[PDB]
Amino acid sequence: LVYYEGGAVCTHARSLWRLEPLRISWSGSHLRWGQPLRIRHVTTGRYLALTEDQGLVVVDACKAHTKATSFCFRVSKEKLDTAPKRDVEGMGPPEIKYGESLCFVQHVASGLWLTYAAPDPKALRLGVLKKKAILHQEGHMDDALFLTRCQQEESQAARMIHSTAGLYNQFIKGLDSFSGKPRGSGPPAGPALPIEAVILSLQDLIGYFEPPSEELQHEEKQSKLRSLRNRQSLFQEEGMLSLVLNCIDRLNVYTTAAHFAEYAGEEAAESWKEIVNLLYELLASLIRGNRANCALFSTNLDWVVSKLDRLEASSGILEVLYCVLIESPEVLNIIQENHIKSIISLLDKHGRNHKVLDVLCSLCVCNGVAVRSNQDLITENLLPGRE
Amino acid sequence: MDILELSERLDLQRFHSHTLRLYRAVCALGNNRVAHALCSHVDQAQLLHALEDAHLPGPLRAGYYDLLISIHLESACRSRRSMLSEYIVPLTPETRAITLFPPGRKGGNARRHGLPGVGVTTSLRPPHHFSPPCFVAALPAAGVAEAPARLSPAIPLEALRDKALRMLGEAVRDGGQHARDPVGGSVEFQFVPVLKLVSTLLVMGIFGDEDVKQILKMIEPEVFTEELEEGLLQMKLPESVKLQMCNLLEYFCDQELQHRVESLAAFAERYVDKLQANQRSRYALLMRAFTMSAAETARRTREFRSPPQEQINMLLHFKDEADEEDCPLPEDIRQDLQDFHQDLLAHCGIQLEKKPQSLQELVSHMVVRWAQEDYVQSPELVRAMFSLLHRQYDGLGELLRALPRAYTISPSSVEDTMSLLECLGQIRSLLIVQMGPQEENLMIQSIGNIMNNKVFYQHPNLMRALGMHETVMEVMVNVLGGGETKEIRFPKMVTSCCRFLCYFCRISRQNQRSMFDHLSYLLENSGIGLGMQGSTPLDVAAASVIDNNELALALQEQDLEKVVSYLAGCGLQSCPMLLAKGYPDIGWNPCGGERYLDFLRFAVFVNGESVEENANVVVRLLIRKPECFGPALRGEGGSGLLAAIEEAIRISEDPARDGPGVPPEENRVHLGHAIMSFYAALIDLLGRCAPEMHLIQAGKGEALRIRAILRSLVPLDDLVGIISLPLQIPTLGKDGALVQPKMSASFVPDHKASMVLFLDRVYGIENQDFLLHVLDVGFLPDMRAAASLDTATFSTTEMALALNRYLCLAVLPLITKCAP
Amino acid sequence: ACFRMTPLYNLPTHRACNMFLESYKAAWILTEDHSFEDRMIDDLSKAGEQEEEEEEVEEKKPDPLHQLVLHFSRTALTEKSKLDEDYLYMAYADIMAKSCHLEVEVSFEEKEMEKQRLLYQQSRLHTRGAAEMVLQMISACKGETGAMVSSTLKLGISILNGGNAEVQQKMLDYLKDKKEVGFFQSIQALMQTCSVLDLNAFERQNKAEGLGMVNEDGTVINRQNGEKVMADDEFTQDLFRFLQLLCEGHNNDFQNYLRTQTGNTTTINIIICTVDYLLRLQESISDFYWYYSGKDVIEEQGKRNFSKAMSVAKQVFNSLTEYIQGPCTGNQQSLAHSRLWDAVVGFLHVFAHMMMKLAQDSSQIELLKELLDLQ
């Protein structure tokens, strides 16, 4: 469904649309009044369409057949349609401006105008600020639309989110397909999983989210940090973080590569460990330096403490925890004795690593504020034994 | 092993250094109990030995220095630093003796400054308190979070002070020789820990005058000689060491400022004595001399009719020398002030060689030389050095900004002031840490002690300078915001947060204005506090606005709109807390609508008269959001007020519609009473917004329009019906047991009083027939009932008391007015 | 109570001492004038021992003033939600602002001399990065009014006075290479925050002063608070003076950049924002007129608020004039297609009626003169 919405949705990716003229050649030409075209949603790959049954929606390309998905921009609502314009080779006349021209969207076949539904009463009581978008014969005067440019960063990020979501969902679907079906002394009996593509995507995204080097100058480093925080927020709002969590959850049920092979085969069992480490590293990259993304774990912190003991990605899980605790005080106020004891057992079982001490130090103080409960629990459980 | 093998065993070095970091973290920010516990694992002997151990790695050396500071010194230094900004000067012989310039042969104005940090200081700083470390002591029977807060562990401060001086001198001398084997492997690791310890001890006040002199000689002997060795400033030191040096210099500059403040206070003592005597003699001589002239006698007497502050201003207005003649004071008294002013300007350096000969020149030249020599890479160091440069160049402005924190007190208030200061230090410490039960108890107890203190009431300007109310508000809000949506914890602390702040506005108008300035913050924090019962930030706001026409007229329509939006949300949605408690689900929250309404009442009604500026705004906002009026008074599909009251009474009779009907608190909400009280508050607020008559006689269109709107909203027949509604009366029955109404769940005379006020202010009683109608329907029956209840058994009943209040407050005055 | 007012000799010494402290502060310490700004700036501009180094020249080490400007630019460029208040920054900005101007017919040569001295004192700053720091802090304020932005604007005005083309060029080059929208976003938000006359506030103030309760401390009748009416008049004038000085000298590059920023993803028309503020201002002035129309004589506070509004309007008019002078044809067309015509119609109505009304009483002559100058 399509809505007129204001707020952070503006800065979000879901508000991003791509204009696709019906011609392949010279599709980058200047847009022209009455020029038929399709409107694509970047993060979903779906196309604005008019459907007899559900009216204005976004449909898949397979169902986009140029009668539902063909739209034009008109400067005025009058039904002139005096002459269909001839196709032009070259960029052509520069008619429509960014942020100045006022455009009315019209479905070519029906001639309907893009407009809002005039929210029914009690919507104000709900405090719902979003207005469903409809196609209507007359519409409203204010139906005109400014077109605003997006950053190359945002466009790239939206496309990458779309592809990453598709890939990881296919991976998850395969894992669910052979979740509870052992292969025995046979094949896993299912479509080949995209291990290589998943690995390369994970590596590319880690490099994409890599933090700037300290050697950099202050101004450029701050600009890179802005870019990184924005990209993290966009990925989070489009749900990549939850997708990574789901992938990790499904890969965790298998303790080891052999246990994975029993269901998937040795060929994927080899890459099991690499994939889990890459997923944890990507999670750390997404949440590092982002207070909101780190705060999301307040509801589910046990998701990390329960996994701390696992041997395959111990360092990655620990880094995830470190980032979360440095950024978010909410997690610190929800900490518990069970969590502290698990972290101390990590010292006991895995060895004397100063990173655990850094985590425990972060548990005590955040942003100049101390947590007495955490302080006292750490003291009581760690110090007196003296081992 | 020997701990010194960690010079080559590096993994162990890192692990142990981070262990020291953890030790500091667990005791960070006031956990004196954890400090005591640590004193067991890392003992005083270990720490002191580590201080002197030259062969340790720098990380371990610094970690042990900082661990000592954290365990023993951090809380005390922070508490003292909090006070250092303030200058509470007792009027004492010691203060009198204080002079900007020590005595000697040179004239004070032209004289060389005395040594910073050396001399007499009378400003009040509360003492440090320490508890010995002992682990064989009897375990208190008292429970956790109720036992008193523990003090920081004790360590021998004079011995530590001497050792710090000695190590600093040794470091200076060896850095003079440029050894290839510095302690810790670096000049940084050699110097920084000692300097941090020394700065902590200075701020704490451990160092004496001679020790300060030795430190000054280490810094720069040539400048601070009192009447070869190389100084740290000449030792060509790295940036972190420079940062510590800057902190030390900041301490000394602060001491110079404090000396200026104290000298000004002493001069004020001495000079006020003379001015008071002169005023007495002059009044006296005027009385002997009133005979000759009347008018010019009047003119001088204008001085004694002036308030004291204006008398001061008049006496001191002789600077320009053009107002000298009009200034009454004689030339000698004037010259005393002029001389002191010149001395002050000289001491601050306004009055105008290669060798500095003063702290200001030393600091300025050092900072400029550092910046010239190298491009500093440390923003913190840059900030500090340029702050010092600013202070040296503008000393008068520093004093000008510091004085607002200066207050002179009699020596007789010293002990109470010190107790109050300790309580305020506790409260200030509570800002940094998260709230808990123990912290809540400490907060409540400190507030109670402060409120018992007489100084709190006598010296409200002192408290406003101290920022007591602001710190209390910061604590309250830090509690409010955290997990606000889920639930509000530590409600007793917020209830205290009024009792303190919310008597505070009553103590003085200036306090009330100070809180009015923070009003919006209180209002935006009010939303959660509503569910909590007792004294609330909305009550703090009401105290800020109450009975002050200036503040009410300065009140903002933005704040009013915020209140009205909250009330609309209340009128549209029920209370989730009540729903969770299992109450019947209605569509709106009478309980919060009532609070917002009485806040608006206090805003619009002052000293018996309406404020039209706020009243009209309230009316307009309320009509624009009419859901605030209630599900009744809605218009379309809306039952009337009278029907609402009747249905509320039926609800009160019927459980499972008045409450959960499956209270320990006994404050259990009764929906019928809540609805009746909401509507009564609404009617009262509308009546209070109603115009005063004199405007109506003047024929002011705005007043007439407002009154017509109010009448349209509330018809008269409904008011009369509510006034006529019967009120249950205590009866004696069934063995002589009293059957008696419950106020919290029943219709009460205050509901009627609101309607009476509305009727009087809006509709008015101008016709005998209507007057008699009201008497025969509603008023007279209630008077008969009250008089019937005027019996020994029934006289003290809450219903009888409520009836008497209702009558005297609303009815009887109305009958008196309508008597003709 | 006036008779009962206790004489000074009857008070306890400590209360009297605090009163003395406040009075002495106000009369002596505050009134005292000491100038250290120029001396500070010179001492920080001078660089030492580079003559003996003889390679540090080729190295180009920043001098202390350059380092301070770099520090504050660092603080500005740091990524965070809000611009924290910095008394050090504001104090040093005030010092630099004083350093520039450092100040009945005068000679042409003297007048050129003053220009040259001012240009030198401006160079001391913009060679070291003051213009870029100004822009960075304006972007950092994120459209929130405050003392930080006030000091930054005053510094910008100080360095830009006389239409300093060098500072102009530097500002523009910085803006165009960085291609950041936050600067103009903050400018727009500050314009929106800028206040106009409020008759409700005026009436409330009048009623407050009429009530005139004595303050509980001593006796203070008609105790004055911050002027509820146009409290931010100085800020509005400084903002528009800064925008005017950008275009001073008929700098077509600014005159067009203010209208449109080609490189940036989005652009803001400061010309139209100025027109909108002017329209709001003339609406306020016409309403305040209608308030005073019936009354024969305007009172003192009304005169004052009229003077404030007319000063703001004069500065706005000069800014709009400077936007187009040279001429800048695009800005001319934008204004011609703007609502400046409606603003002018309203101003003409007010001008005529106030002219007639104020001619009647001589007590209103100064306000009439100000009105005529504004026309």
Place this chain on the structure above:
Amino acid sequence: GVQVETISPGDGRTFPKRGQTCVVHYTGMLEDGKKFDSSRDRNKPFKFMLGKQEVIRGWEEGVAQMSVGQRAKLTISPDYAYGATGHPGIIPPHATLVFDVELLKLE
């Protein structure tokens, strides 16, 4: 239970009485041998009054048996010591305590 063994003898006649301040140097170890307290590290003798209940039951009774100048080892069960709750951070729950005590003087 308090269990006292003489490391070094005292005078053998002068024994603490109620209301009499005892001055001691002590070193505290857990039964495993870990040290948690020592007055000598602080370099300050520890003074306590008998019958007052400043110190734990074990110290009361054990020092009651000692003599001036006597050095002794005191073994105290948890029930005479801090017991189940323990001393947080310092002493674990259910910890037997070993102390080396020198009774310097009575005052």
